[PDB]
Design a protein around this ligand. Structure first.
Ligand code: CDL
Ligand code: CDL
Ligand code: PLX
Ligand code: PEE
Ligand code: PEE
Ligand code: 8Q1
Lengths: 88, 55, 80, 128, 110, 178, 124, 67, 98, 459, 111
């Protein structure tokens, strides 16, 4: 058959993995609720690059109107879970 | 894409029907054997119809 | 079942073309913050890949050995 | 600098290449807000009926009815005999008929006159 | 041609299914080792398509080129046939190079 | 897709969208990862060259010139994700999506199978019917007299309230319904 | 190819035309010419049903090859000598055709040379 | 045969697919070599190509321009 | 930047409702309540159809002229006819350029 | 022939004496029995026709049309009873009476030996159709549609009456046998030209000919389902049958009097096929497709060759069945959503798979897929036209391409894509609708096995 | 009778049996694709034999088994041409179809 169904824990772990592979973010400092603009001191271009990295990670495109408001890892996890119908 | 394929195939089918009509009108047959016997020097119309159908 | 992600510490750009990109960018005053994300494409089992001519010649060794065996059999058989 | 892109009927001008969206005035912003408000009010009116548990059936759309009526029933009441209309109607109505009459009449006259000469090679033509 | 063209589509479909329904060769990385049987089959089909001697494509395509060369034929048609023969190997090499060689370019979840 | 659009895009939003489009098309041109990364850092540097411009007119002119450059140098066949509006699998599974109201027309013998599912569906229907009036009342309360100004909807604010107009958002068939 | 370059770029009047050839009599330069003969009769080719284009002067080897294919059916690799003989006879026919081409070319070239040369001798 | 995803590592390989691919590639190459050993004429040509300039006028039957 | 408080609150409410609905689409262990030879294929799909066709061709189709027409077999020199016992003479003594 | 006419008349007191809840059952059962009885007329003698008496006769041309009418009546009854459920008993009985009277007039029209009786019945068919359209039509445009349908027909038919009485005065008879056996050539004169026009234009407008076709979209769209069924399936064929009967006495004038009609028919079949590509109403598309098919039939009749008449007969039968099936298919969706707009309801294949299969088969028969009888007739007509002139193949091929285009366009628009979200009243298909589609489609496919039954006298 | 005609017609005939069974119970189960694949493989192995007959003796045939209709001097009959082209193309197409349906059993598993 095809790939096993995706889970919330896997989504969050993969999001944190991608963010910890980013150089402008301290691995120790980073948290699921860590704000990008406020806590990590990032700008809009870094957020765009993070969104593109998430799209490359999960193999699907996020529209620009929705990606504008993903300012913490938890929001990205919620968006991915709701789009792919992941409930547990 | 399916409608596009149908359109192109019917464009070729125009020539197919032209070939059929010419062969019935001039050779009095649709079968292969009679057509071969009665067309020693085949004119351009049926062959161009067949070529359009093949294309 | 229930696999987990490998350690993120291992993905390092040294020894890979990402290191060359990093040094060429430092030669310009720039830095790439995304190399460790791409390092896995070069780190593990994808370290070495064959060339086009070597890919076309995939099973040439075994086939050539079998062909030599067959022609030697032909050499040694028609002498009867 | 780079070669310029020019639009046409079947390949229109991209939004990012439109000078109109880069020369903005407050009245333009007001127009955009008015358009957004109209769209939002229509969306709310539609969604209040779409999500109604009580409602059963097809939600009638006035715009679709207007489109169909304009395309079918409203055309003749708004027709005027005009040099443009008259010339286009005469052309597209009777030009092709006379063209095809000429073509077919010429072909059949040639064929009949060639038959009268005894030269058509009608051998094996027993079906018509 | 039926044999190896069906095989080529079959290999392409196996590649597509393995890489989560992806068809762009720019996201197809190094599958020469990851998909050995598919790689072998596609290489054999590409060699048959290009007229490698004594394969399926040899006995027909090379005879066709030979007959086209030795006939009272349009010169332009002959030249265009030869250029198409070049381009056949060209896109076969493109497919193999972009789909099976190099480093992976597909999403991380293998 | 999920967020209500605004009346217009700011200069900042247009700038970020142009940045993302340029990066994606450069990735389409630069197939390999290392070369793409190199040219993407170069693009980022060229993009940050005018990061702190204060004259809006010259910033707008720079944006227009960048858009012209992108259009002239775009990839004629850019990479598209399979499920994206241009992908090869964009609307592949739309024929498998059946609306939930079709389950009411099922024969009683069909509903003899799957009894617990239909009991829970009855529970959901009672919930919707008991929440609809409160949803309508809340929408009437929280709306300006001259009609809504945007396509945004308010959340629930009371104890047992549900967000207005939720049935057709919650009861989406699926992304892979079969 | 060189013949095409000679005909299309050089003086085409000095090159044979494949459509209308040979234009010279078959006994012009030869004192006596032997007529080409046949080994297979019309009835044998009619019964073998070869083809209207395979009924050339090489048809007897083709008949032998087809018969030997038919008798040794399960062993399809056993009819090597017959195929070689048919190929050799076809190659000989092709060489004869090339000889005819070269003969026509040389005859036409010599005729042109000699007639302009006798005209040059007569004009002075 | 149960194979599980690996997340940024080379996928798990079975012996059967590797041996089958190697066997069939070797089969193709062996067949090519065997054919070229036994039917080299089909690729390199068999009958010699005559040179028209090597043909005398006596065998080609043209007069020596003086008659 | 980011969501408004109302946006986030409505999104999490809708998320809870949607996750409950998706959980509720899941089936209990009893949901599908259903109300109450080696060579068979080769004899019914091959042998029976060929019996009918062979009977149909042999006794019905070939009962009328020119329905099944075979091109006559090829004849070569040295062949022997089965009906008349004729022998086709050999073919003219090749020059034998061996 | 009385064995067919008398049971059809008996259908009237039988349905007027039935209980309020048994009218549909009784009418359907006895209509099917009458169709079974009428099926026995297909046994034709070859050389000449079946002359039962002085008043009626049967031909190889008339018999398929009679069988089609008798078979169409029960399908009309099955289609009608859904939208007439709220009607009173008396009005339902009146509707069934209209249908029975129409059947009786049609069966008598196709068998009359004499042209004045044929004219009388052929005009008598108008009244029940007009009553049905103007009384049980749904919209307010049914009155204008009925006026168009009546006056377009009569303006052509009255000169035919004058010409027929003049011809009987000059010849002494109008009996079709005497007409055929004592045929004499029509000279080249203005009087003969106008006699030809008076004998032709009524059947021209009943086909309808392009340029005289404006009544057909109105009448076919604005009529109830049974009215549209009978208009498309049978009433259009009256013109073709009349032409085949009447052109016997028109030679040799037809040789050049047919040129404008041939030009109009070819170019107008192109025009109507193109029109079908841009249509917002689902019934109008079917109506215009009918116009194109009847234009092809007009060409076939005008060229006066045996292959042309054979193809014309086959095309008439096939078009009748296919158009009736398509109208019923459109009516099912209209009953679901109460609107005729094509793009209102989309993606119906997801909700109704078997009805989608019926749609696909009807669309395939509309585009004349081999070896259906539609393509048999069309190919015979195209070959006859090619014999008439080799340049006709351009227009024939263009018409084929456009026909396939709009047929598949209708199929894709109605059945494919995604469903309309807000429309939630699409119930599963009833047994009645599926049975009606099957009863339309199965005779079409069964006629392929025996094409000679519908090829006509020239066979 | 010569087995050539019977085998050539049987190869074409047995391919329609699953179409007739499409309304049967096997169409509602998950065994239908394997059944169709097996039918196609049997058709291929049956078509192999007339190819051998042609490769031996060059046997070619035409079968006008059924008369459909006759229009005047023209006769239309269900006729099959079984020359070299047919007897060579049928086994190749059946072989390719067999392989492709066995592939489809895996590729289209979740459809
Ligand atoms: C079955 C298939 C379908 C078939 C059916 C469908 C098709 C057929 C039916 C429908 C189409 C036919 C319509 C017929 C025309 C109806 C006109 C009308 O209703 O006017 C009322 C309408 C209302 O009147 P009003 O409100 O009192 O007037 C105020 C005006 O609006 C104020 O306007 P204005 O003042 O601005 O302009 C008015 C003025 C100025 O007008 C203009 O500015 C425009 C020019 C109009 C006249 C000249 C045409 C110029 C362009 C073309 C020139 C000819 C080119 C060559 C044609 C042949 C090519 C081979 O008028 C003129 O000067 C005209 C003078 C005449 C000179 C030329 C006469 C040529 C006669 C016909 C020649 C062609 C024969 C056919 C050849 C076919 C070969 C196969 O008047 C107009 O507005 C229209 C006026 C212009 C009419 C021009 C007509 C040209 C079309 C051809 C006519 C011939 C066909 C009819 C046969 C019977 C004729 C006796
Ligand atoms: C050629 C194969 C031979 C097979 C032998 C046995 C064939 C018996 C079939 C009898 C006639 C079919 C009745 C049509 C009504 C639909 C029935 C239905 O509702 O399905 C319920 C049933 C239950 O399925 P379900 O799971 O409940 O759900 C179904 C869903 O609704 C959705 O299910 P779906 O999406 O699968 O749709 C159902 C199906 C059914 O829909 C159809 O469209 C089938 C009808 C074909 C097109 C009809 C108009 C085209 C003009 C052809 C006229 C031929 C008449 C010949 C005499 C027929 C005698 C009645 O649609 C299709 O399969 C695709 C249609 C494409 C057909 C292309 C064929 C072109 C011409 C081929 C040759 C024709 C002449 C033969 C001789 C040639 C020289 C040797 O489904 C079926 O059983 C499928 C029907 C089998 C397909 C037949 C296709 C070819 C047969 C053509 C006529 C037979 C000629 C026999 C002479 C010897 C050969
Ligand atoms: C929208 C669709 C409506 C229906 C269409 C119906 C089509 C009706 C057209 C009838 C076809 C032709 C009618 C008569 C045939 C020839 C007509 C004439 O033009 O031909 C010449 C006739 O010469 C002159 O042209 C006379 C006719 C001129 C007067 C007619 C006016 C035509 C103008 C067009 C008006 C539109 C008519 C339709 C109104 C709707 C032939 O020369 P000649 O050999 O010497 O005469 C032959 C007759 N003889 C033997 C008795 C002597
Ligand atoms: C299945 C179960 C039955 C198995 C038991 C039957 C065993 C053999 C019985 C043979 C039947 C007897 C018989 O063949 O008698 C002849 C009998 C009638 O005589 P004909 O002239 O050949 O046809 C009628 C028109 N002249 O022939 C038959 O009808 C039986 C054989 C018909 C073959 C099947 C038809 C295949 C084509 C289907 C229709 C396709 C549309 C038409 C396409 C036209 C193409 C140009
Ligand atoms: C709804 C649209 C349909 C329109 C159809 C209308 C066209 C009908 C055809 C013409 C109608 C009149 C025909 C008259 C009946 C024919 C009888 C006849 O042949 O008698 C002629 C009489 O011929 C006529 O009188 C005809 C003159 C025309 C009278 C009315 C003219 C009206 C317009 C005519 C042209 C339009 C017809 C075709 C148009 C079709 C629709 C656009 C000769 O008789 P005798 O006097 O004895 O001559 C021989 C001895 N000397
Ligand atoms: C592969 C082919 C593609 C190539 C096409 C060409 C690509 C374009 C080349 C050059 C583009 C430019 O210089 S574009 C000129 C850029 N200059 C400005 O935008 C001035 C004002 N800056 C701001 O408003 C914000 O700081 C903002 C920058 C939005 C960040 O916002 P955050 O920090 O809040 O995220």
């Amino acid at each position: 058959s095809d790939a096993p169904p995706l889970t919330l824990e896997a989504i969050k772990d993969r999001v944190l993995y991608v963010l910890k592979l980013y150089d402008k973010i301290d691995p120790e400092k980073l948290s699921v609720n860590s704000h990008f603009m406020k806590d990590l001191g990032l700008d809009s271009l870094d957020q765009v690059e993070i969104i593109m990295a998430m799209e490359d990670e999960f193999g699907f495109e996020i529209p620009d109107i929705d990606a504008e408001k993903l300012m913490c890892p938890q929001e990205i996890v919620d968006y991915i879970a709701d789009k792919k119908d992941v409930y547990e | 894409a399916a409608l596009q394929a149908i359109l192109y195939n019917r464009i070729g089918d125009i020539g197919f029907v032209l070939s059929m009509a010419w062969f019935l009108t001039h050779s009095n047959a649709w079968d292969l054997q009679q057509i071969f016997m009665l067309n020693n020097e085949c004119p351009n119309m049926p062959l161009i119809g067949l070529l359009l159908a093949a294309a | 079942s229930k696999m987990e992600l490998p350690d993120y510490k291992q993905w390092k750009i040294e020894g890979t073309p990402l290191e060359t990109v990093q040094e060429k960018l430092a030669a310009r005053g720039l830095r790439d913050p995304w190399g460790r994300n791409e390092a896995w494409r070069y780190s593990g089992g994808f370290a070495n890949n064959v060339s086009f001519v070597g890919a076309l010649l995939k099973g040439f060794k075994w086939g050539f050995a079998a062909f030599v065996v067959a022609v030697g059999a032909e050499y040694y058989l028609e002498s009867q | 600098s780079f070669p310029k892109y020019k639009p046409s009927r079947l390949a229109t001008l991209p939004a990012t290449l439109d000078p109109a969206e880069y020369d903005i005035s407050p009245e333009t912003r007001k127009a955009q807000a008015e358009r957004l408000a109209i769209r939002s009010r229509l969306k709310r009116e539609y969604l209040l009926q779409y999500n109604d548990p009580n409602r059963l059936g097809v939600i009638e759309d006035p715009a679709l009815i207007r489109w169909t009526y304009a395309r079918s029933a409203n055309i003749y009441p708004n027709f005027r005999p005009t040099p443009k209309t008259s010339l286009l109607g005469a052309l597209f109505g009777i030009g092709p008929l006379f063209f095809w009459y000429y073509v077919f009449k010429t072909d059949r006259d040639k064929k009949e006159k060639l038959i009268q000469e005894g030269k058509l090679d009608q051998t094996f033509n027993i079906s018509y | 041609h039926a044999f190896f063209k069906a095989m080529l589509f079959m290999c392409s479909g196996s590649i597509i299914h393995s890489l989560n329904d992806e068809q762009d060769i720019r996201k197809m990385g190094g599958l020469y080792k990851a998909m050995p049987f598919t790689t072998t089959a596609l290489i054999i089909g590409s060699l048959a398509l290009t007229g490698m001697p004594y394969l399926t494509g040899f006995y027909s395509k090379d005879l066709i080129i030979e007959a086209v060369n030795m006939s009272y034929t349009n010169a332009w048609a002959l030249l265009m046939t030869l250029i198409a023969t070049s381009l056949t190997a060209a896109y076969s090499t493109r497919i193999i190079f972009f789909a099976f060689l190099g480093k992976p370019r597909f999403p991380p979840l293998v | 897709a999920f967020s209500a659009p605004a009346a217009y895009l700011t200069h900042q939003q247009k700038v970020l969208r142009l940045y993302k489009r340029a990066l994606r098309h450069l990735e389409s041109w630069c197939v390999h990862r290392d070369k793409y990364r190199y040219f993407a850092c170069l693009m980022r540097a060229r993009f940050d060259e005018h990061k702190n411009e204060k004259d809006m007119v010259k910033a707008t002119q720079l944006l227009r010139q960048a858009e012209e450059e992108f259009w002239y140098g775009q990839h004629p066949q850019p990479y598209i994700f399979p499920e994206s509006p241009g992908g090869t699998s964009y609307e592949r599974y739309e024929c498998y999506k059946v609306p939930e109201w079709c389950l009411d027309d099922w024969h009683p013998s069909e509903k003899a199978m799957y009894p617990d599912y239909f009991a829970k569906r009855e529970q959901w229907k009672r919930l919707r019917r008991e929440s609809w009036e409160r949803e309508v009342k809340q929408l009437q309360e929280e709306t300006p007299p001259g009609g809504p100004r945007t396509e945004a909807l308010p959340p629930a604010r009371k104890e047992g309230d549900l967000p207005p107009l939720w049935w057709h958002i919650v009861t989406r068939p699926r992304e892979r319904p079969m | 190819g060189a013949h095409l370059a000679r005909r299309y770029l050089g003086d085409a009047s000095k090159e044979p035309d494949p459509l209308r050839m040979p234009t010279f009599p078959p006994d012009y330069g030869f004192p006596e010419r032997k007529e080409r003969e046949m080994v297979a009769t019309q009835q044998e080719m009619n019964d073998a049903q070869l083809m209207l284009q395979q009924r050339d002067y090489c048809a007897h080897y083709l008949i032998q090859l087809l018969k030997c294919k038919r008798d040794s059916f399960p062993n399809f690799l056993a009819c090597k000598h017959e195929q070689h003989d048919w190929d050799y006879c076809e190659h000989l026919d092709y060489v004869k055709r090339m000889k005819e081409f070269e003969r026509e070319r040389r005859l036409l070239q010599r005729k042109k040379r000699r007639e302009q040369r006798e005209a040059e001798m007569a004009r002075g | 045969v149960h194979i599980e995803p690996r997340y940024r590592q080379f996928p798990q390989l079975t012996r059967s697919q590797l041996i089958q691919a190697e066997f069939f590639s070797a089969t193709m190459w062996f067949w090519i070599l065997w054919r070229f050993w036994h039917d080299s004429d089909a690729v390199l040509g068999h009958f010699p190509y005559p040179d028209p300039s090597q043909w005398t006028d006596e065998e080609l039957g043209i007069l020596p321009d003086d008659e | 930047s980011g969501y408004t408080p109302d946006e986030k609150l409505r999104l999490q409410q809708l998320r809870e409702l949607r996750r409950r609905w998706l959980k509720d689409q899941e089936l209990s262990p009893r949901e599908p309540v259903l109300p109450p030879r080696h060579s068979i294929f080769a004899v019914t799909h091959v042998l029976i159809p060929v019996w009918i066709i062979h009977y149909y061709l042999k006794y019905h189709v070939t009962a009328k002229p020119y329905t099944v027409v075979e091109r006559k077999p090829r004849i070569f020199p040295g062949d022997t006819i089965l009906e008349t016992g004729e022998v086709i003479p050999l073919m003219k003594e090749f020059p034998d350029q061996h | 022939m009385l064995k067919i006419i008398i049971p059809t008349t008996m259908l009237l007191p039988m349905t007027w004496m039935s209980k309020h809840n048994m009218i549909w059952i009784n009418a359907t059962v006895h209509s099917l029995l009458i169709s079974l009885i009428s099926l026995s007329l297909l046994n034709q003698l070859g050389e000449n026709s079946l002359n039962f008496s002085l008043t009626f006769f049967s031909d190889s041309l008339s018999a398929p049309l009679l069988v089609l009418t008798t078979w169409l009546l029960p399908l009309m009854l099955m289609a009608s009873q859904s939208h007439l459920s709220k009607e009173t008993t008396t009005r339902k009985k009146l509707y069934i009476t209209m249908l029975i009277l129409l059947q009786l007039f049609l069966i008598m029209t196709f068998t009359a030996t004499e042209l004045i009786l044929f004219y009388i019945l052929f005009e008598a068919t108008l009244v029940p159709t007009l009553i049905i359209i103007t009384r049980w039509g749904n919209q307010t445009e049914r009155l204008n549609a009925g006026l168009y349908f009546l006056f377009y027909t009569l303006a052509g038919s009255l000169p035919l009456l004058v010409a027929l009485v003049y011809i009987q005065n000059t010849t002494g008879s109008l009996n079709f046998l005497i007409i055929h056996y004592w045929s004499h050539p029509l000279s080249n004169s203005w009087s003969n030209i106008f006699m030809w026009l008076a004998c032709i234009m009524a059947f021209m407008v009943k086909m309808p000919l392009y340029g005289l076709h404006l009544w057909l979209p109105k009448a076919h769209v604005e009529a109830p389902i049974a009215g549209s069924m009978v208009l498309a399936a049978v009433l259009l064929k009256l013109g073709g049958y009349g032409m085949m009967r009447i052109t016997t006495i028109l030679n040799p004038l037809t040789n050049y009097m047919a040129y404008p009609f041939l030009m109009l028919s070819m170019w107008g079949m192109i025009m109507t096929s193109s029109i079908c590509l841009r249509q917002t109403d689902l019934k109008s598309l079917i109506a215009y497709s009918s116009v194109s098919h009847m234009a092809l039939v007009i060409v076939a009749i005008m060229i006066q060759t045996p292959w042309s008449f054979m193809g014309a007969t086959a095309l008439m039968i096939a078009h009748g069945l296919t158009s009736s099936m398509l109208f019923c298919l459109a009516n099912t969706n209209y009953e679901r959503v109460h609107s005729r707009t094509m793009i209102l309801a989309r993606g119906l294949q997801t909700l109704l798979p078997l009805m989608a299969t019926w749609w696909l088969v009807a669309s395939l028969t509309n585009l004349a897929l081999p070896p259906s009888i539609n393509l048999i007739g069309e190919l015979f007509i195209i070959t006859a036209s090619f014999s008439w002139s080799n340049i006709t193949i351009i227009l024939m091929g263009m018409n084929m391409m456009i026909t396939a285009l709009y047929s598949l366009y209708m199929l894709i628009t109605t059945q494919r894509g995604k469903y309309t979200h807000h429309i939630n009243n699409i119930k599963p298909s009833f047994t009645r609708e599926n049975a009606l589609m099957a009863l339309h489609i199965l005779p079409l496919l069964l006629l392929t096995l025996n094409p000679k039954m519908i090829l006509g006298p020239l066979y | 009778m010569n087995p050539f005609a019977s085998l050539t017609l049987t190869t074409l005939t047995i391919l329609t049996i699953p179409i007739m069974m499409s309304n049967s119970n096997i169409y509602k189960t998950n065994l239908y694709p394997n059944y169709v694949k097996t039918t196609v493989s049997y058709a291929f192995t049956l078509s192999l034999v007339p190819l051998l007959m042609f490769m031996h003796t060059g046997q070619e045939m035409i079968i006008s088994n059924w008369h459909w209709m006759t229009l005047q001097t023209v006769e239309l009959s269900l006729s099959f041409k079984m020359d070299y082209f047919s007897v060579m193309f049928i086994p190749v197409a059946l072989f390719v179809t067999w392989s492709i349906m066995e592939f489809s059993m895996w590729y289209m598993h979740s459809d």
